[PDB]
Design a binder for this molecule. Structure first.
Ligand SMILES: [Co+2]
Length: 9
């Protein structure tokens, strides 16, 4: 989750 969101943002 943490990384998915970093990338998304
Ligand atoms: Co970064």
């Amino acid at each position: 989750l943490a990384e998915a969101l970093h990338n998304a943002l």
